[PDB]
Amino acid sequence: AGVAKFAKYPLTFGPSPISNLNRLSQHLGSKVNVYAKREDCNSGLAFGGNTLRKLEYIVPDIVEGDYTHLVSIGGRQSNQTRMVAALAAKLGKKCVLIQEDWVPIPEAEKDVYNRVGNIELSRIMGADVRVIEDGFDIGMRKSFANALQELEDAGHKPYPIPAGCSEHKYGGLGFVGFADEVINQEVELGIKFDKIVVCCVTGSTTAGILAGMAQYGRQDDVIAIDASFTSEKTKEQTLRIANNTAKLIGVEHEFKDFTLDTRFAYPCYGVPNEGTIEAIRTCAEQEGVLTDPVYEGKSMQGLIALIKEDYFKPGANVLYVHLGGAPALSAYSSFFPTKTA
Amino acid sequence: AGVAKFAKYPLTFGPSPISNLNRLSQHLGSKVNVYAKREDCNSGLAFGGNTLRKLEYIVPDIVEGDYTHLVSIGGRQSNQTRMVAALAAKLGKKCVLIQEDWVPIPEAEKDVYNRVGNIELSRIMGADVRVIEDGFDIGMRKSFANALQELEDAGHKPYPIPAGCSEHKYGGLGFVGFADEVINQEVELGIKFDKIVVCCVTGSTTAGILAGMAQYGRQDDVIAIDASFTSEKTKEQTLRIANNTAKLIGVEHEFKDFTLDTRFAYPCYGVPNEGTIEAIRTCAEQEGVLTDPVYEGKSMQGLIALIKEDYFKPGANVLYVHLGGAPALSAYSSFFPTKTA
Numbered sequence: 001a002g003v004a005k006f007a008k009y010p011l012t013f014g015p016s017p018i019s020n021l022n023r024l025s026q027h028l029g030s031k032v033n034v035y036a037k038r039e040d041c042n043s044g045l046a047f048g049g050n051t052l053r054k055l056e057y058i059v060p061d062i063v064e065g066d067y068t069h070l071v072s073i074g075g076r077q078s079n080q081t082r083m084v085a086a087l088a089a090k091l092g093k094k095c096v097l098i099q100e101d102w103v104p105i106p107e108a109e110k111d112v113y114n115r116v117g118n119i120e121l122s123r124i125m126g127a128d129v130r131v132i133e134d135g136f137d138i139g140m141r142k143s144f145a146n147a148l149q150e151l152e153d154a155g156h157k158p159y160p161i162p163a164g165c166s167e168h169k170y171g172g173l174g175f176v177g178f179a180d181e182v183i184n185q186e187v188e189l190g191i192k193f194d195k196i197v198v199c200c201v202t203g204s205t206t207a208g209i210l211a212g213m214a215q216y217g218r219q220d221d222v223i224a225i226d227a228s229f230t231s232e233k234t235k236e237q238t239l240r241i242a243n244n245t246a247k248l249i250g251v252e253h254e255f256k257d258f259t260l261d262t263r264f265a266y267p268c269y270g271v272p273n274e275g276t277i278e279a280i281r282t283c284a285e286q287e288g289v290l291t292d293p294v295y296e297g298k299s300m301q302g303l304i305a306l307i308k309e310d311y312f313k314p315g316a317n318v319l320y321v322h323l324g325g326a327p328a329l330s331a332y333s334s335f336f337p338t339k340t341a
Numbered sequence: 342a343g344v345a346k347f348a349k350y351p352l353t354f355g356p357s358p359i360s361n362l363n364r365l366s367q368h369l370g371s372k373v374n375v376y377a378k379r380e381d382c383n384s385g386l387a388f389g390g391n392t393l394r395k396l397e398y399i400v401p402d403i404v405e406g407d408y409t410h411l412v413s414i415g416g417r418q419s420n421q422t423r424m425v426a427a428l429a430a431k432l433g434k435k436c437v438l439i440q441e442d443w444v445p446i447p448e449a450e451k452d453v454y455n456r457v458g459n460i461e462l463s464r465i466m467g468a469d470v471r472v473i474e475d476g477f478d479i480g481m482r483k484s485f486a487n488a489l490q491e492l493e494d495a496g497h498k499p500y501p502i503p504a505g506c507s508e509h510k511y512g513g514l515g516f517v518g519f520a521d522e523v524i525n526q527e528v529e530l531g532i533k534f535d536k537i538v539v540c541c542v543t544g545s546t547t548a549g550i551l552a553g554m555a556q557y558g559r560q561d562d563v564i565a566i567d568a569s570f571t572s573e574k575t576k577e578q579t580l581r582i583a584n585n586t587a588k589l590i591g592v593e594h595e596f597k598d599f600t601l602d603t604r605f606a607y608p609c610y611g612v613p614n615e616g617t618i619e620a621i622r623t624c625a626e627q628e629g630v631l632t633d634p635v636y637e638g639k640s641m642q643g644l645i646a647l648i649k650e651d652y653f654k655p656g657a658n659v660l661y662v663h664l665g666g667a668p669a670l671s672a673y674s675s676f677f678p679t680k681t682a
């Protein structure tokens with residue numbers, strides 16, 4: 001036990017708040033009491049989001065070192081790239097982003113998809129944004145390394161930050177701290193969360209939550225709603241991270257498997273489905289809380305699905321984990337026509 | 342000055358946090374110490390913003406009586422209409438929003454300005470978005486009353502929420518509370534702010550801050566940066582709201598004038614000048630903080646210009662007020678091309 005033995009650099013206002021989505025509760029049958037951990041209300045750094053939690057434990061190394069460039073990677077509307085740019089700015093360092101094509105840009109958006117959303121924000125923050133177009137892979141890419149070798153030859157000291165930080169040694173520490181927070185908040189709010197619903201694609205977030213909740217023997221409370229539509233590698237990598245992070249923080253527990261629903265990943269990574277959009281509309285319509293079509297949207301549809309199929313015990317307190325990602329909504333304006341009548 | 346005398350309804354996480362933009366301060370020649378009270382990180386209701394703070398003192402009057410629909414008005418990319426849509430989605434009411442044509446939509450943003458950004462979000466929250474052609478104006482609009490009659494003719498009980506909640510009778514109370522928070526936060530920071538810089542269009546925000554700071558005789562610390570490009574009315578309406586709010590709370594002092602730097606509104610409301618774009622970029626590149634081309638980008642360029650001309654005492658602590666607006670940044674992507682390295 002102990003994430004405390006690792007250096008942390010503050011990038012958020014502190015413990016992310018928890019929302020009481022009581023109105024969305026009744027709309028779903030008053031079967032459960034839905035709540036939301038707002039990681040999308042993280043800090044003042046370009047809208048916040050889950051990646052900021054992860055970066056807090058990575059920054060120390062960046063600063064202690066003497067790097068001069070923060071190089072990350074993702075797909076078009078990648079949320080991480082936007083927050084890494086925000087970090088480089090705050091650290092007074094250069095930034096090189098790689099926006100590959102991981103989502104089949106729905107024709108009805110082939111225009112704004114590359115000019116708006118999160119990619120616009122990275123440019124405004126002055127990062128060297130490079131629009132590449134390679135396949136989707138929640139793993140190491142054969143371009144991210146090139147950029148690295150590139151800046152090195154130029155005479156710079158580049159700092160690597162893989163997709164989702166999932167393959168960074170400390171990629172899972174941030175959400176371990178997330179668990180510590182929830183436990184403390186349950187006591188302040190006086191509300192015990194029976195389950196934790198969170199989206200998953202590259203790992204680190206879920207894994208950190210697993211290894212962290214395990215500190216209290218509550219790994220099982222976790223319910224990871226897939227969104228990568230590749231349960232294969234996705235569930236394996238998350239597990240590889242869950243075990244490693246566990247070792248770092250001292251938890252002996254061994255993760256062999258975890259609840260990873262996969263009925264809402266379709267039709268593909270980045271592309272929603274009638275259900276996804278319906279979840280966003282419902283959540284937005286009921287709680288005034290916005291969710292995107294890529295991550296938080298699907299994980300929200302799954303949440304509403306489970307509440308339907310009386311999956312949770314009657315009167316259970318479920319903690320929905322809003323990891324952010326709403327700034328990409330603009331690259332999906334076509335999926336949301338105006339209310340009928 | 343008893344503002345607590347008025348009923349308040351929770352819409353934010355509590356007192357907005359204050360960021361220490363020490364990097365930007367250094368970047369600008371270490372002339373002053375810049376801070377930023379984050380109204381843009383005040384709630385989980387669709388990104389949040391200044392309107393929400395205003396609304397907290399208006400919601401009580403709503404739910405109290407029997408109103409079916411909430412109706413507001415603003416430009417195509419209004420932030421208030423987007424937040425009202427959330428407040429509506431939350432208070433479990435109907436929402437009809439009038440989006441007037443307050444901005445000469447740049448040719449490069451014509452096929453986006455009305456489908457992306459804030460207008461989009463307001464639609465996801467199931468608001469009845471009505472796009473009207475009427476032009477810019479911070480005063481009571483015809484289309485407004487027309488809809489108030491329309492609905493009231495169809496057999497409903499709409500609640501009138503004018504632009505910026507400025508014309509509303511309780512529109513100023515919100516930021517009178519801001520002032521309160523400021524004085525308290527000065528106590529917890531162990532410092533005192535010499536000046537407060539904030540954008541100003543419809544007037545309710547500044548008027549609130551003015552009437553509020555007056556409770557402590559510090560109204561002169563306020564520096565409003567205009568973004569309307571219509572000095573007279575904005576100054577006159579702000580001055581009007583400030584005096585009414587002054588009575589409500591209990592402040593005797595009457596405002597006959599206030600500091601309104603009109604140097605940066607150019608070329609007009611809703612359109613940025615090269616200085617605005619430069620400011621947005623400088624803040625983003627220095628702090629990772631996002632400002633918009635319509636409101637905060639201009640108040641920020643005003644802040645920067647004032648610091649250059651040594652307007653503040655050396656080592657002065659200046660509190661910049663971030664009122665949000667960044668969500669609309671998606672309708673102005675043409676203005677921020679990828680920087681070069």
Ligand SMILES: Cc1ncc(COP(=O)(O)O)c(CNC2(C(=O)O)CC2)c1O
Binds near residue numbers: 073079080206326
């Ligand atoms: C809102 C939101 N929800 C979930 C996730 C996924 O996190 P995990 O990879 O830790 O499962 C992201 C990530 N973002 C990436 C990006 O490019 O933005 C893939 C890294 C997210 O932004």
Ligand SMILES: Cc1ncc(COP(=O)(O)O)c(CNC2(C(=O)O)CC2)c1O
Binds near residue numbers: 416419507542636
């Ligand atoms: C980011 C931002 N900054 C300043 C203002 C103006 O404040 P005042 O008019 O209350 O001084 C708005 C308002 N909004 C309106 C809208 O239609 O959104 C005009 C009401 C704002 O959104």
